[PDB]
Amino acid sequence: KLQSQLLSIEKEVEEYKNFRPDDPARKTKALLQMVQQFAVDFEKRIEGSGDQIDTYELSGGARINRIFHERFPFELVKMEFDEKELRREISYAIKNIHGIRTGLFTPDMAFETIVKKQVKKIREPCLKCVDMVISELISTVRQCTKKLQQYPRLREEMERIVTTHIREREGRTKEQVMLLIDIELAYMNTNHEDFIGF
Amino acid sequence: KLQSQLLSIEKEVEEYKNFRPDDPARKTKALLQMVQQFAVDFEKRIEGSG
Amino acid sequence: LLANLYSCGDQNTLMEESAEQAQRRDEMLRMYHALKEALSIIGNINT
Secondary structure (H helix, E strand, O other): OHHHHHHHHHHHHHHHOOOOOOOHHHHHHHHHHHHHHHHHHHHHHHHOOOOOOOOOOOOOHHHHHHHHHHHHHHHOOOOOOOHHHHHHHHHHHHHHHHOOOOOOOOOOHHHHHHHHHHHHHHHHHHHHHHHHHHHHHHHHHHHHHHHHOOOOOOHHHHHHHHHHHHHHHHHHHHHHHHHHHHHHHHOOOOOOOOOOOO | OHHHHHHHHHHHHHHHOOOOOOOHHHHHHHHHHHHHHHHHHHHHHHHOOO | OHHHHHHOOOHHHHOOOOHHHHHHHHHHHHHHHHHHHHHHHHHHHHO
């Protein structure tokens, strides 16, 4: 009994017996251990890497975000475009495009004007999807810092630094999303999978 | 073309510009980063991860 | 991340231990020494 107890305790008290409060080597060794633990825990929840799998919950960032990319399709279909106002504006467009001439073939600019109006609507669900994902990431960072409780002032700083970074990346992520929609308005490519010939 | 090249140099020379022959803080963070690099690289070579 | 954390000033206060750990390690040292003495006495009794 006593032999077993010494073996269990020995691996740790080997270090405690040499403690000196003025020991930069210990502080820096502790720093590298906490940072390596956080980066392993963080990757585990997002990427799924490692052999420690949580079989009770959903993984957090990994599968909450994976589902944000499958709630988002729902946001893109709640548009409710009024058919009657389309058919009116199509009619007025054709007549105004022909103008002073009677017209001989269906115009193209009518097709381009209608699409541009609907494409401009997508901006709303796209800026929601970004805010949803930012919120989920901040959550997973706050779970990962629960393991640094024995070090106050290091759980605060690591939260602040990783949190600030994720927020500042919001601006650049939204600009690219906006730009990818302007690209869609700029040119109407009808040689794609479309009603060719019709 | 010049601006593209200068971007590949700034990331590194920001450490050199403040170089001193005797800087314990510089050495300490150089040790820690190199220890972390080795452990990650070694595990990657045998485990097959990443 | 590691370089950012290290670069902050007052490294002696960033990594300060909570009072609970000071108690935990002090107790484990007393437990460790006490176990050795007890195992010494048993060895000197079996004889």
